[PDB]
Amino acid sequence: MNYPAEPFRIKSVETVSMIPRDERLKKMQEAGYNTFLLNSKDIYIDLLTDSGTNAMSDKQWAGMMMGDEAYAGSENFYHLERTVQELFGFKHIVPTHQGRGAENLLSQLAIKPGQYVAGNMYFTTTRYHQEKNGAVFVDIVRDEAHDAGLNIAFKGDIDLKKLQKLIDEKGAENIAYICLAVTVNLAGGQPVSMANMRAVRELTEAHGIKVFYDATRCVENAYFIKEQEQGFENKSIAEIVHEMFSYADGCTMSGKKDCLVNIGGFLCMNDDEMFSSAKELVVVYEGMPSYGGLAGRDMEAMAIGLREAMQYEYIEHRVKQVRYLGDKLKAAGVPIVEPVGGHAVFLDARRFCEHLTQDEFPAQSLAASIYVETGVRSMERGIISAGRNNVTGEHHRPKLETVRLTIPRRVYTYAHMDVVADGIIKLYQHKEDIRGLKFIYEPKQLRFFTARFDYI
Amino acid sequence: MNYPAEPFRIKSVETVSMIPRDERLKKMQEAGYNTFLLNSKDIYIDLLTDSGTNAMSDKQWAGMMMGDEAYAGSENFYHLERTVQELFGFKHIVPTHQGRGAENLLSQLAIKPGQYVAGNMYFTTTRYHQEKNGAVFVDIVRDEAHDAGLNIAFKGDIDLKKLQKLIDEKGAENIAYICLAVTVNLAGGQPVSMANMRAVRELTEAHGIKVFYDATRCVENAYFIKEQEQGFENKSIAEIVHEMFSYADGCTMSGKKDCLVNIGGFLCMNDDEMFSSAKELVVVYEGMPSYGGLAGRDMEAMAIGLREAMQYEYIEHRVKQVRYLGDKLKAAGVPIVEPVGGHAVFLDARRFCEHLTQDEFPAQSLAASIYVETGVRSMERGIISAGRNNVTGEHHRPKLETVRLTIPRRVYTYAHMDVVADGIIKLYQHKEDIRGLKFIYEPKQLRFFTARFDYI
Amino acid sequence: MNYPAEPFRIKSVETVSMIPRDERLKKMQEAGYNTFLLNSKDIYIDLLTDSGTNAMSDKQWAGMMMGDEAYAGSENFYHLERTVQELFGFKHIVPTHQGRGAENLLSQLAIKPGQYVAGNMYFTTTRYHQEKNGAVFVDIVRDEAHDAGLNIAFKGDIDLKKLQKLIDEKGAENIAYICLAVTVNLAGGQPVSMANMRAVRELTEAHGIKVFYDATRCVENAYFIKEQEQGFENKSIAEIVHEMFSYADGCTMSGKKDCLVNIGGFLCMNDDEMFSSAKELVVVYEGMPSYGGLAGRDMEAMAIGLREAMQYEYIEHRVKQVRYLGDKLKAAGVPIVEPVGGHAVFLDARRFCEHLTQDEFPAQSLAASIYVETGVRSMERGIISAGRNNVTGEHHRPKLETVRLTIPRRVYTYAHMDVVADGIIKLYQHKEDIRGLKFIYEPKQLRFFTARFDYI
Amino acid sequence: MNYPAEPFRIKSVETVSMIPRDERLKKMQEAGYNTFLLNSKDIYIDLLTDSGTNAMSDKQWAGMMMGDEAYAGSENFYHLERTVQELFGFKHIVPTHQGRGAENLLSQLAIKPGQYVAGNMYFTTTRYHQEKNGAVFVDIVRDEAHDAGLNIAFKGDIDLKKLQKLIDEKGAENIAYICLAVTVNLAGGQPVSMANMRAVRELTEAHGIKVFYDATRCVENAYFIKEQEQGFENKSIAEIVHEMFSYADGCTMSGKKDCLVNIGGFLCMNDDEMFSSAKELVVVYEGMPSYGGLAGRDMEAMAIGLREAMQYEYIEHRVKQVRYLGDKLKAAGVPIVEPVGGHAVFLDARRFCEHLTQDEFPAQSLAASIYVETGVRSMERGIISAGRNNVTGEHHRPKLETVRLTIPRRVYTYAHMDVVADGIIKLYQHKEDIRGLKFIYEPKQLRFFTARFDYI
């Protein structure tokens, strides 16, 4: 059934400014046409990211009042611990303040310099921590994942042949681990099949290679398996999640995504020796094995939220709400990355703004247009975010020139989705009018965060 | 716009679910076929009432943490007091735990036995407190308000000819006060025009008759004035509200409606001696005049909520979401009260259940049947709620035999409206299947709350 | 063991102004030397009342986030219902917004005009509702209770001989009920023995007379039985509470006292017919049998708080903290009502300010002195609160001319108790310097609430 | 006053309890005789640490409901930023999830391998991040700070002669920065004088050496300046704090101490290029510069808490409550570090356990023994926390072998202090009963957190 009603009601609301177009235009200009510079208080619908922006439940808020704030041995940690062991089925769990804290720990524990880490594409923080610790990254995703127009299921799947080739050519001893991400963010949030997770587990296990999941959107992933993978029709979301992780040696998790919280993450593993070493390192960067840089109340909220995420109707609606936005855009001819993923819709700004060269920052400009026309903030994921080559001074020119409409969980309705869609569709119907942008201030680093622009 | 999106985001959620038809069926019998008697857990979308069921905002919840719980001199009481003085324009305020607490005070303060109270249609608790204190209720609303299907604006208006007649026939001295309600709940949430409020004030003042408003849905009422009364189109909701009350001597208010809270009300008046006497009486029934049977944190929430209610986009969306439900029902040919009111859609039980006489309680029955087929809870607003005539002993017989789909503020989405509209439509297909009801337990007053029936 | 440490720690604090003596003096003067007129924000330690001023737990605050706000059938009501049935052992419970709401219902249900209601002294609201409904009040407390200097246990006990005398002289048919209060507020919060409750139950039952408790401080009462009544040494607080109520036909309860909440109360009874009638009346004044003028979250908080009140260490500390203040004052020779009761210490201002006549308002003036010297607000319970005879224009001259230091539960520490004690002791050491007060503004009614004074 | 009462009221509470001696005994063995390894549920009064264990205020909890959870541009980040700029006077702020997150950034940003970092005594995580990044730690605190029993003011002061010597012997170019901590935790919470901060700034500035403060207990430190440094007696806490930081180039802060929160920290600096580089690095480890691994609601709580910390009566009471505990212990002859510091009383493990050598870990053992006899949890602050010398491999041997009774802010009362003091005193009676400990598990760094021992 295409678009279910919200399987929840509103307990409480977040106050927003409903400032009109003329005032939004002034805010956009004061932000140098960079949506990253906009004030939260000036935004109606904020689709910058689905990270940490989720609406919690009444049950989680009750948990928020029961924070056992002890430095060691907090009841909230034990709740988190037993929840994650039950639901993910790992032996050991170390909390971290969010996903990149867990990635820091994992890559220091699991990588010898010179070794390879192979994955289904990559995410920036994850790959950074791998490389920082001496790894060489190797993309082993299926070639299809790089074709953003290709409508196929389980587009996040690892190519077993590529994995085999890496094993044959570099040797198993020289592969630190396989980093299998669910879903695959860089491909537009594409799911990985259970068949693929099993095949990868089976090949790596034969060579004694470890597999660690980047589990950030593992619940959206489980919903795709439920919906589209033959034989998972009688399985609960919890059963699918538990089976997914049975094919890994551990994971890095951002609770800020699929655990329905505003902060929080953790590291899981099965190996006792690695657990011991991880506990030795968490104290350096995060905090105790029993708080890991989180307040007691946040371990509690994340424990409760991960269990809420198992509800079929919740995750079905989460994914289908994103789908609604994608479908509506596609029906109007708006160019998007296909198929639509679990967490976001990516506009193809290259095609949307065909009259503009990449050097005129079509994605950055389209994101500015969207905020002005609708009060919606979206994220530039194109040439600006790619940054400038420091050696040569040339832009990094990504194949993907996109605007990301990233959907927080349980925050918005289908009517908000219409606001976004109708506005983008209206812009599309006169897309030729969207003006190119030029730098007026460009920092040396992290340019996407603070750069300012004006129209050409 | 016809149907604007929610002018807020979801801050927190609570889970909703439906129990099977057969468990609901047992449940409906268990509750004597009275919807009021089902359990919250057993209801899927709860449209029993917009009273006390509202979603509060983040700001209200911040105020909830700032409860100054002192018996006298609470910062929260000061903030409520100054908010109501600013927004309604009355000299004095006495908080009460809810609206009927205020009606109890007003009726004891302002009625000599044998006097008449004239109002624009009755309300259940209001009339009961009028009658308990020895008043005769006279209905002075226009005839058109009693005609369900008749689509005319400002149906809540007092017929000035009827008021004049009451003055000529009884004498001004025998009229305790005019009870002017905004909106008029039992006519279908129908608004009163500013022109009418001004006319009523002018006529009553000339004769020395006091006017007390039932302020309960005054913001919804102000929305209709802004939308439909010529010359108000560029006035703010707040200006409109402030002008409305300028035509009154005081008011009763259930804050559980338009003040966006879960508990709370108050009594306002301009008269100093009435204020003194009211403080004497409040102590007996409610609490000290400095809290009136409310926690400090609730006086705070109500102060905050009443000001939030003045936001144009909030009340526009509130009223239009109700209108959406009505539009869908009406497009499919489901009989409703017209025009759609501020807070609810009222299915016209007489037309829905042509095959029944009003004596067979079609509304109470329909309410029951909707629960059985859909798990949506709705309320009886016809012959049962009307009560017994305290002179003859016969049922009062309102022309309006209606079943209320009552919308809490900021709780539901258009998708929930769509779920409701689909189920109602389906039930309509087999309307002849709805059976007459008979009393098995009748309470001696306000019988609709806890009466039990059995099928005829 | 004399004074135990707090059997809890501070989860959160309430911000206070620490304004110095000179600024307190200006606030006192702006309040016309009437502590009832002081702003909460200007008070360091507020001992005006133990009603509704309690600090809730983390567990109760979690309950506050789980308010099921449904108009009927709320999960919170069922929680409250089962808690009260378990702990108090009554068959039926109707929630009310606080104690006087329950008293309203009880007196309307249980009294025929002309009938007598006999009790161990009285409280103002309780006795008012009895008389409003046609009852004649008869004090049947032991004569000792009226001797405020007499240090004896179970000073709240009813004199069985007085009860017998009333039965013999007026006839059982003409006694509406016995109103047995635990503790007895007017006597300084004096406990009633289990022996007394049983004797009263046994006598009334033989004559078919009903007994309803005014149960407001029934848990403090149970602690005295535990501490001082032979044979209750192996009994839990819960066992004692449950046995107490086994000697009654029902009760009126203010949760705002011993249920550790800021708002809330309820009516209990065993009789089915009375329960039915009570449900018919609660809708008139309070709300539904399943909310009774409370938000869902408050029924939840009160359910949780009543169960917390059963913890031995909590109630032992509550009562012994009050005792600490009393003991400390008595050791310094400060005149107090004896023995110290469960909830408050009463200063004898007649003796404290011997140089002043009652017409110079010694209690009112002493309460003003206390606030000025310490930042502590206390309540005048003397000639000002007694009011003026409207017939004659003379003061009502009470035998008790007192200042009440009323202790909210779990809000203050022994260090706050020292602030209060040290300041009063310092004032006592030069008590001759305390000046008489004269009216400068006196309202006709409720004079204690708003009257203003100046020094003679 | 010696011991002022709490300058706040209790808003909410959490229950405390003690489990029997024999269950505690099993528990202490279960945790390898390391206090860090017991469970919060099993501790009666938890004095393990003042880090993250503070009670928040009603205002902070109101801010907690107002979490603006946006990835960038959150109102909460803006409020934190402007609060720290106003109160500390630094140009730039980068939030971090807690203090060691900030130390990680500072150490990576400001140290070239082979450089020296000189500080007023070491701290565990600080030294580890210094050393990890290739710095040699040089202790430049006065000798007197290493002498536990020596009662002198401003023990935290840097010995300027030692700083001068470091500059002459190594050269200014080889000193990365001076790490000046306020207060000095491991000397016993000992304050640094303004005179010393000014002297240090003057000497370092002349040589072009940067100074970065560990701001963690800066408010406690400001209290000691106000109380004891001539000429500061009429300065506000805020003026003092602002002046302190005027002598620094930046700071690291764990907000979990003096900012009155349960999570949170930040890095401040004046230098624009260091700020740019820090924003680059924060993204890797913590989060975007606009949240730094914190929920918006926590940036809010920390902004609010830091301003609350400036209230004179709050910090006076905070420090004096610690002092009370120390005074009681000292009056009974229990050996402690003197003078008593801002946040904790440190029992002098060397004198408490004369019969043990430092190699037999007297502090770790005493910590264990106190838990067994009292159920009060305390922390090791001696040879175990000092760690291994990263050149020789031997334990570092601090003269200060101490056991910390660490007081969370606004959680406990003087009665709790009395309970602690009684139990410690009793244990002192039989001090010879405390047995040597030996390692059974030693972590490779920050070993004290999770090391396990067995008795010798």
Ligand SMILES: CSCC/C(=N\C=C1\C(COP(=O)(O)O)=CNC(C)=C1O)C(=O)O
């Ligand atoms: C009595 S039925 C349940 C409560 C209900 N209105 C309650 C109203 C009251 C009484 O207010 P309280 O419910 O006591 O706060 C007064 N006037 C008006 C116009 C009302 O609609 C409603 O569902 O519509």
Ligand SMILES: CSCC/C(=N\C=C1\C(COP(=O)(O)O)=CNC(C)=C1O)C(=O)O
């Ligand atoms: C590391 S032991 C546990 C945390 C502890 N202090 C932590 C401190 C940190 C690190 O701060 P975080 O714990 O990472 O917020 C820096 N400086 C200073 C002076 C501290 O006392 C304490 O208990 O005292």
Ligand SMILES: *Cc1c(COP(=O)(O)O)cnc(C)c1O
């Ligand atoms: C968001 C994300 C991360 C990092 O988690 P944080 O909690 O943001 O540090 C890692 N991998 C993927 C695929 C992510 O989306």
Ligand SMILES: *Cc1c(COP(=O)(O)O)cnc(C)c1O
């Ligand atoms: C406080 C009190 C009441 C009334 O309860 P409220 O909740 O204040 O209405 C009745 N009896 C006694 C003895 C009380 O103390």
Ligand SMILES: [K+]
């Ligand atoms: K967040």
Ligand SMILES: [K+]
């Ligand atoms: K409610």
Ligand SMILES: [K+]
């Ligand atoms: K209160």
Ligand SMILES: [K+]
């Ligand atoms: K904490």
